[PDB]
Design a binder for this molecule. Sequence first.
Ligand SMILES: CCCCCCCCCCC(=O)OC[C@H](COP(=O)(O)OC[C@H](O)COP(=O)(O)OC[C@@H](COC(=O)CC)OC(=O)CCC)OC(=O)CCC
Ligand SMILES: CCCCCCCCCCCCCCCCCC(=O)OC[C@H](COP(=O)(O)OCCN)OC(=O)CCCCCCCCCCCCC
Ligand code: HEM
Ligand code: HEM
Ligand SMILES: CCCCCCCCCCCCCCC(=O)O[C@H](COC(=O)CCCCCCCCCCCC)COP(=O)(O)O
Ligand SMILES: CCCCCCCCCCCCCCC(=O)O[C@H](COC(=O)CCCCCCCCCCCC)COP(=O)(O)O
Ligand SMILES: CCCCCCCCCCCCCCCCCC(=O)O[C@H](COC(=O)CCCCCC)COP(=O)(O)OCCN
Ligand SMILES: CCCCCCCCCCCCCC(=O)O[C@H](COC(=O)CCCCCCCCCCC)COP(=O)(O)O
Ligand SMILES: C/C=C(C)/C=C/C=C/[C@H](OC)[C@@H](C)[C@@H](OC)[C@@H](C)CCc1oc2c(O)c(OC)cc(OC)c2c(=O)c1C
Ligand SMILES: CCCCCCCCCCCO[C@@H]1O[C@H](CO)[C@@H](O[C@H]2O[C@H](CO)[C@@H](O)[C@H](O)[C@H]2O)[C@H](O)[C@H]1O
Lengths: 55, 431, 385, 125, 62
Amino acid sequence: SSLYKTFFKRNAVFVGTIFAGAFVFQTVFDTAITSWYENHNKGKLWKDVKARIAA
Amino acid sequence: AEVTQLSNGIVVATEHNPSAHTASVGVVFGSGAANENPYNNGVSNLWKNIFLSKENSAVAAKEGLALSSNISRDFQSYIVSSLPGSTDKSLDFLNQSFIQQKANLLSSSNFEATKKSVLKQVQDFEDNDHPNRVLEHLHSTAFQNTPLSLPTRGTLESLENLVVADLESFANNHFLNSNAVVVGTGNIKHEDLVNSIESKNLSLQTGTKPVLKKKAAFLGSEVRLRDDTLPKAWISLAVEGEPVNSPNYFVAKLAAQIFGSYNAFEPASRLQGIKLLDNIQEYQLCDNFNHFSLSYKDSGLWGFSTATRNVTMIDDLIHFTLKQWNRLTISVTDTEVERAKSLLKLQLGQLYESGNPVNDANLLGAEVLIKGSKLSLGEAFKKIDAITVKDVKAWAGKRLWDQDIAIAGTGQIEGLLDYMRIRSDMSMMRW
Amino acid sequence: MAFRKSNVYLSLVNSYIIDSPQPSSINYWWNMGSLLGLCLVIQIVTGIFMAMHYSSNIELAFSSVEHIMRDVHNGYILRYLHANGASFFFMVMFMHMAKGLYYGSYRSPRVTLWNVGVIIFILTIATAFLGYCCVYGQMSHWGATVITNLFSAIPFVGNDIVSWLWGGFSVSNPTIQRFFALHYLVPFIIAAMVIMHLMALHIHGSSNPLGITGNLDRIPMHSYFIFKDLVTVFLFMLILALFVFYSPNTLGHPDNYIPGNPLVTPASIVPEWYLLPFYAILRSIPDKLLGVITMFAAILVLLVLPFTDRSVVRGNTFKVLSKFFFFIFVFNFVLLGQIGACHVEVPYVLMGQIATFIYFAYFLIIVPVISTIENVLFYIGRVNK
Amino acid sequence: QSFTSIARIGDYILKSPVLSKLCVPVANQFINLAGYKKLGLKFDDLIAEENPIMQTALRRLPEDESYARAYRIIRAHQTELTHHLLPRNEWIKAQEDVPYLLPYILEAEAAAKEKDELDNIEVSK
Amino acid sequence: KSTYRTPNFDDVLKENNDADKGRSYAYFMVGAMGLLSSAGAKSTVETFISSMTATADVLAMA
Ligand SMILES: CCCCCCCCCCC(=O)OC[C@H](COP(=O)(O)OC[C@H](O)COP(=O)(O)OC[C@@H](COC(=O)CC)OC(=O)CCC)OC(=O)CCC
Ligand SMILES: CCCCCCCCCCCCCCCCCC(=O)OC[C@H](COP(=O)(O)OCCN)OC(=O)CCCCCCCCCCCCC
Ligand code: HEM
Ligand code: HEM
Ligand SMILES: CCCCCCCCCCCCCCC(=O)O[C@H](COC(=O)CCCCCCCCCCCC)COP(=O)(O)O
Ligand SMILES: CCCCCCCCCCCCCCC(=O)O[C@H](COC(=O)CCCCCCCCCCCC)COP(=O)(O)O
Ligand SMILES: CCCCCCCCCCCCCCCCCC(=O)O[C@H](COC(=O)CCCCCC)COP(=O)(O)OCCN
Ligand SMILES: CCCCCCCCCCCCCC(=O)O[C@H](COC(=O)CCCCCCCCCCC)COP(=O)(O)O
Ligand SMILES: C/C=C(C)/C=C/C=C/[C@H](OC)[C@@H](C)[C@@H](OC)[C@@H](C)CCc1oc2c(O)c(OC)cc(OC)c2c(=O)c1C
Ligand SMILES: CCCCCCCCCCCO[C@@H]1O[C@H](CO)[C@@H](O[C@H]2O[C@H](CO)[C@@H](O)[C@H](O)[C@H]2O)[C@H](O)[C@H]1O
């Protein structure tokens, strides 16, 4: 695949890039999951109930 | 190395050598075992042997002539040697064996006798010549289902199925003027030969062309001929090398000179300035090894061969060797490159500046068939000196670093680990 | 072959304890290793049995040790064996290490053996620290406090590491409970490390008092050394028994008989005797960071000996200058301990600083200088020109 | 420390009348205090052998001296294990305390040094 | 049969399209696995490490 070769030119991915990619992934994935999860439960969350019933 | 060449239908090539005492004249065809197929494989070897048959040799002996024939992958040769003056008798013989006695050599009595001999030849080789047998299988697997895969001596199966017709079929398709170069080495002059040839005329199947086929390809693979009854383990391993006349032809040969060849039993061999020797001599990992950079028309093989009685430490032998190769990409030293330059020159010298004319004939013929001319040693030495560490690293990063390999071996090879383990050693881990 | 050699399990016992080829001349100093094995076993066995009646909660810790002392049948024997046992463990480890220093045991090809040993020393000290904390007396609280704070010297993340170790705002309930959990763990890691120690010892075998090859005259471990070790096993037990039943508290501190108090650090605070020299080293540096570094370096410098000893022969047996300085070092080590037991006062402070320098100079200066001089002395004292 | 280095410094002192009159006596004293001769060993018997240079040297040592070395070593371990010394008439005398292995050691050291230099030579084109 | 005649491997051998097809796919898979394992290990280590930080019941600032 040329999409792979443009970045790694026939070499495997080195640890440095692996660890570096893990750090980025860890944050991007958390945001994506939390948003989906919270959106899926829109209405049930405390935040949602706190806005409406302003107590 | 005087480059003298002339064309008038037939392409004549000579190389005068003041100090010689003898002369060699013959014809070199641009076809070899690679121009054969799985079924007529061994046909060229067959032609070589009928040309050297007792009958056709007794004739040449009375005339004071010696017969020579060499079957390679990209070419074939038939050479006649004689004194510096009898150069004309030589031509009369070539003119005879390929125009006159063409039928006498293919008689039922002669063919059957020759076929029976090469049959016994090839069998003894497959039964006893383990290092060459293995090197042959390296080609067989590395280039499987491609031209360069066919052994030069041919196989037993195809050999015993060959008939007189096959020789002719091959001969009509390959022993042609357009796929030939008449060679003359020793002390004979260019004009002296060109006139002796121009004396006779005719043609006999002229204006034709050799057949075409499929392009040679390297396939990462292996073939294992395990035989526990043999005393050693013989193995050859290599990556796709450089085809003759390639930008990295010399860099590849230099690279192979760095790791060189070794013979555990010879004192001086044990002292060579080769890093790898520090690692293999402690536990005596092998009896010998030899690196090579084989070059052909379409491809090549770069690697090494080795023999060992150390059947329990073969993995260390292979590990240290491939580990050294990794170095060519990331850390080959300046002085390793310089030592190789010197030693490479010396070897090319011993090859091309051999005292023997038959060798020069084969070298001359083969070279002009490909690049039209023979490579001058002085130009080779300049290219070799021009090589730098960067050149070497660039070459290894392309041909060596993390590339597929071809493996072949016979004997006590239980200790030779799986393909993937060997394959993993083609590179090193890093950050 | 014999079942002891062919069986998968027995062959291990056979190679290490039965047919193991020992240098015919190893003296009693080579009995310290078997003694350390006994100590570890004693410590583990007594600890487990006490563990059955102990409570790590900071409010029940001290009283549960009192419960073991008063209500548990033979409980006071378990505790005194454990407590005094820890002390003997260090006295024997100090002798084992000193034996190593004197006979060049650290020299090639036994460098790994020595390094793993340094690992064991560190784990053993940490284990002892953790165990002492579990009693939760005055010394326990403040010791936990001072030692965990050692890490606050690490720049930037320093204070977070300490809060993480404590599990709170100060040494408290979560600190004692994890410390007891950890105290239970490490002895098993040490054992694992001991096995590695023995594996390194085994490929090269023991050295000997002469410092030369033992290959020409070996005698089997079984009988000769199995019985020679028994001699020291019994003397070790006899002396430990003297302390356990007749003077069970002379090696400890009375302050640890007072429940820990977070608001009061006793003026009579003093670390456990075996930690005193390192305590003195740290106390000699008028800088927080440099102080902890130097103290930790005091242990790590043991790793440089294989490289600072330039002698062409292993061991001090035939070396007058090396023998003299070896004892300077030993006695300097005891003085460092005595300094540690004193207050931060005029004569003592300078003495500690001077003794601290002597401690490091031995490994970094004296050993390499003296060994080089002795090499030449042995040469010119015989060769003619 | 290499014996080449020890010898270099030692020879220098041994050739200098001033240093030689000052050091040698102290060295003689040192060797007598060392006490290895009372165990029946020669100094060269004390050299730690677990390294390639010494293994090379001990390999090259002639058969007869090798058997002699073995005896002195075995006899020493035995004497040491009994906590005694050998009777005076068995002590190695100064005349006998000869550097028999030293020449083999220096030879082995020089060969390794050259091999190390040759393994790392630079080239000037 | 001659050992020189390699048996048929056509059923698994890819054609002369892109030689690095197997390579690129192989290296991407291993890279992604390595990438995800690292994130997993990091979060596993952080899960245990944090279990030692001050508990909810002791964070009370009186
Ligand atoms: C506070 C916590 C302490 C815990 C540690 C307890 C264990 C202590 C170990 C002692 C030790 O390692 O000392 C070793 C030195 C070296 O000694 P060596 O050169 O090898 O011995 C030659 C033998 O006489 C051979 O003689 P033997 O025939 O084997 O009998 C020896 C002697 C051994 O006694 C022992 O228990 C050894 C200490 O038995 C007796 O005659 C004693 C009768 C009452 O022995 C000495 O010189 C002792 C002075 C330091
Ligand atoms: C972190 C680093 C820690 C290291 C610190 C060191 C540990 C502290 C020291 C504790 C005790 C260790 C004493 C020294 C270790 C034993 C020394 C040794 O091995 O001595 C051997 C020696 C005589 O043996 P030879 O084999 O050399 O005799 C020649 C025969 N031809 O035997 C002798 O010369 C006699 C032995 C005399 C021992 C007196 C020791 C004094 C110790 C003070 C006790 C501490 C209590 C307060
Ligand atoms: C739990 C603690 C330890 C155990 C069980 C242990 C056990 C042993 C044993 C059984 C031996 C062989 C007999 C002997 O020489 O006593 C030995 C040898 C040795 N140990 Fe340890 N050891 C421990 C800690 C250490 C430490 C802390 C060091 C070093 C800092 C050390 C250094 C050595 C050395 C150098 C030898 C080889 C001595 C020689 O043969 O000259 N050991 N040990
Ligand atoms: C290398 C082994 C060990 C060492 C050096 C060690 C050391 C110590 C020390 C110094 C103390 C405080 C002694 C005091 O003044 O009372 C202690 C206490 C304690 N240890 Fe250990 N210990 C070891 C192994 C064990 C094991 C394996 C356990 C757990 C099963 C254990 C359980 C305890 C308990 C229950 C206490 C509290 C009771 C007491 O004060 O003795 N110990 N330990
Ligand atoms: C972790 C290490 C802790 C301890 C290390 C000490 C090593 C010594 C172990 C002693 C085992 C002796 C067995 C002798 C044997 O099997 O030979 C038997 C003879 O056994 C006997 O005569 C028994 C004598 C009483 C042994 C004393 C028990 C020791 C007390 C244990 C304390 C150790 C904690 C072979 O005898 P034979 O050779 O004459 O035919
Ligand atoms: C107590 C035992 C429980 C677990 C047993 C399971 C055994 C699996 C161990 C995995 C180690 C892989 C090492 C491979 C290696 O070094 O090859 C290296 C290559 O390593 C890689 O490519 C990275 C692989 C990253 C994924 C590893 C899985 C992460 C660990 C997950 C948690 C497992 C408990 C050699 O590669 P080369 O063949 O090209 O020369
Ligand atoms: C921290 C541990 C580190 C690990 C090192 C392990 C070393 C073990 C030291 C203790 C050895 C003592 C027990 C060995 C038992 C010898 C008898 C034996 O192996 O008989 C075995 C059968 O054993 C069993 O069925 C049960 C063994 C359970 C062991 C429980 C501890 C006979 O085995 P055998 O060698 O004869 O096999 C012949 C080939 N068919
Ligand atoms: C070494 C013992 C731990 C083994 C647990 C494996 C059983 C599967 C459940 C894992 C849950 C624990 C972590 C968690 O909740 O994180 C969750 C993510 O878990 C994963 O990705 C788990 C994949 C496992 C990869 C681990 C490879 C091995 C780790 C070795 C460390 C040296 C949540 O992450 P987070 O806190 O949001 O950052
Ligand atoms: C969870 C595990 C943890 C946190 C492990 C930590 C391990 C730390 C070190 O072991 C490797 C450490 C024990 C070791 O340092 C190298 C010792 C020599 C420390 C010596 C030591 O003791 C003291 C002591 O005992 C006290 O008692 C009341 C009081 C003390 O000051 C007043 C000290 C003290 O000032 C020092 C330096
Ligand atoms: C215990 C739990 C911990 C899990 C942590 C996960 C660790 C992941 C490590 C991942 C990759 O580590 C990385 O691997 C690749 C091979 O895959 C290595 O690549 C090496 O082999 C490849 C494959 O032949 C070569 O192409 C390459 O040139 C070579 O450098 C790379 O140099 C290394 O840096």
